[PDB]
DNA sequence: ACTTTCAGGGTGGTATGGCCGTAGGCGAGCACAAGGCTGACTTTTCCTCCCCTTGTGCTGCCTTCTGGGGGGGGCCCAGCTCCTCCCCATGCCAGGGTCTTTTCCCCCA
DNA sequence: TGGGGGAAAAGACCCTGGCATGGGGAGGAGCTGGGCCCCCCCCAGAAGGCAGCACAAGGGGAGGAAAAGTCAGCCTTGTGCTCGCCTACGGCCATACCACCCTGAAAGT
């Protein structure tokens, strides 16, 4: 549907920042990080869906996602390859 | 020993798109490298596609998917349209 | 029959036959389809036409007649899509 | 204010679990994929791989953002830091 | 005798040879190329496994887990260089 | 019929850490690592053959591909392990 | 006597309007041969090879200095500093 | 076989900085840009010399340099390829 | 534990690649200015760094409630597999049409 | 005013047409693995609100360190000449790898 970017809640963004090493976080960081995550996900999902449609399938596969990430310079170990 | 390049065809396209503008040798040698880079990019992506799908043939579908994966936005859109038009013209004339 | 060039049959200016030969010799697949050279030549010719039209516009802006690497670099850096496609490429004498 | 931040960094740097909730991440991934193809199915492993990649990407981005923040003599990260980190990275 | 047990390797020389022949890399593949690639792969796997085992021992564990693999990779400088743009699943 | 290096990776773990096991998730990461480095070396050795107009991937091309990809100390040891196997393989 | 800064802006415009090499060729050739000495003794060099190396080096340095200027402006400064270069390199992925 | 990194003079570094849009330059920028240039040149030259040695040649060629640059995601046009 | 594909032994054949010969392009080396560039000095002035203050937003804590996580079951749709065959791609040879190399001279830089 | 690019000529090489042919994949069935959907529940974390405090930002001062101008020297560079060394092509032949048929074993189940 719509309005699911808010599912990446403020506490989740704070946990990710604390994993990064951030000590204090400004209030607009949450919206900026949501926009950034949205852009990254659109890029990866577009590549993965192109890979899926090339196979005449209707299921986005972990292999499709792995190839989409690999063709962006971000190799992912663990889900095959 | 005769070296091969896309200079003749680049010149023909330049004449078609700009009737009177010329081109320097350095610019032609840069255009040849550009054409070779794009060719190698599309060919590598199509080969990876065919290997992922366990296919031994590189076809128009693989080339189109590689173009969609590499070129951005309207560039990819128009390149895909040009490729489809060229393939249709080729196979529609024996 | 008369030897009709496949480039002329497809309506392109790029060498469909040479593209087929490089695809076969390039060790990309065991086999290469009959539409792959026709598609690749069309894509390459479209991109060449776009980049050359922008380079010619850049040269016409500078009151010149002959395209030089500076005009190519100006066209690439001033076109958003071409900048994205070639954003890791260095041009000699391009500035 | 700050000692809990340190004892939160030390906790979420030592653990490996996912930081974002799986159900909203799944819904967001499907919402994004809807603009690319209608009626798409998704493997659970595919969504999980997307989640791991996204979380790793955001953790690296936040590391670079923290570096940008310390560059400007600050401990608070601001959207300018994220924008500078992304511009220097090339995104 | 298997091709691996003529030069003393654990990795499959025959399987690597078939992978190279079927991988669309060149029109021909030599007879020492699979042996060399198997040796290189075996050495790299042995090094990564040894460092990951050291990391697992440091965590009072008898099992290798993605956390230990990521710890070894990020700690070792050369491995950090080689696998620098690589994400490990559930590696912390 | 789905092959993997899971058989051969295990035999190398029992030579460096005989008492340490490996998880199912971590062992699949090991397969994604071996499948990655193999394609890296075979994708650079296939370029060295093309640049020099050679149609054969020999141990000399694999040696150069290892030298171009692996960092300083890893390339010195991986090359030495490779040339020791090829010498032993040729000699009976 | 021009004010401090106008000549700097003139230099910026002039060097962004031109395409020539800003590093003298003989010292760069000497440095390239110096560096290649430790990789292989008695090594010869094509003039085109030295040319390509100089072109790549200058493009890399111009891009790095642009990123350094961004880093300097981030800290509310107009003077680029070694700390700015280090931050730029670390973020792009050359210092880790 | 002597200090040749000092041949990358201060005026050349300022010219490169102003091409990069830098307005004012600190005096410690030169000695650090020299080291950065040295590291980049060492990487590219090591790759080019590895190609030259594989080709059983004694002269490093522009095509070897082009391959070395392409191997780092630094493709260069105008010198072949 | 069983097994089924696939790695290995054996034999022929040729095409890739190593060896030797050879000859020229071009890379190294040495003068020779000379003048444009670089190095060192001086003024100054404007930028950077430190300090102080403030208010503003960030964080820590309590409480409530909501929605995500964990099963339990269904089902049905899409991914994987097997058998046909036929049409597409490959291999080889002849012949010509196109693309490469050499000369120049006049228009754009 | 000069130098290199756009046209012309010879040739050589590889592209296309033609013929024979094995195999890849498109398609038609079947089958079932799991992805989607609904249901219940419950409690862990998200959300909102309040207090307070510490941190970023703005203003002010000082000093120090680049910028700009100047002058003298130096060493880059364009030209000219020589040498000889390496690299690229040619000719020839050996043997290494592919192709294919059988068999047993190993690794995936």
Numbering used by the authors:
A (entry chain B), H (entry chain F): 22 to 102
B (entry chain D): 32 to 125
C (entry chain C): 12 to 106
D (entry chain A): 43 to 133
E (entry chain G): 15 to 106
F (entry chain H): 33 to 124
G (entry chain E): 40 to 135
Paper lines:
pmcThe specific interaction of proteins with the nucleosome is central to the regulation of chromatin function and dynamics. The tardigrade damage suppressor (Dsup) and vertebrate high-mobility group N (HMGN) proteins bind specifically to nucleosomes via a conserved motif whose structure has not been experimentally determined. Here we used cryo-EM to show that both proteins bind to the nucleosome acidic patch via analogous arginine anchors with one molecule bound to each face of the nucleosome. In addition, to study nucleosome structure in the context of active chromatin, we analyzed nucleosomes that were reconstituted with a promoter-containing DNA sequence from a Xenopus borealis somatic 5S rDNA gene.
We first obtained three structures from a non-cross-linked sample of the 167 bp 5S rDNA nucleosome, which contains a 10 bp linker DNA on each end. The three 167 bp 5S rDNA nucleosome structures, which we refer to as closed, open I, and open II, lack density for the linker DNAs and differ in the interactions involving the core nucleosomal DNA. The closed 167 bp 5S rDNA nucleosome shows density for the entire 147 bp core DNA, which is wrapped around the histone octamer, and the open I and open II conformations show additional flexibility in one or both DNA ends, respectively. However, we did not observe a state analogous to open II, indicating that the flexibility of the core 5S rDNA increases in the presence of linker DNA. First, the downstream end lacks density in both the open I and open II 5S rDNA nucleosome conformations, whereas the upstream end exhibits high flexibility only in the open II state. Second, the lack of DNA density is greater at the downstream end (beyond superhelical location [SHL] +4.5 in open I and open II) relative to the upstream end (beyond SHL −6 in open II). Specifically, R77 of H2A near the DNA end upstream of the TSS inserts into the minor groove at SHL −5.5, contributing to the stabilization of the DNA around the histone octamer in the closed, open I, and open II conformations. In contrast, in the two open states of the 5S rDNA nucleosomes, R77 of H2A near the downstream DNA end adopts a conformation that is not compatible with a fully wrapped DNA turn.
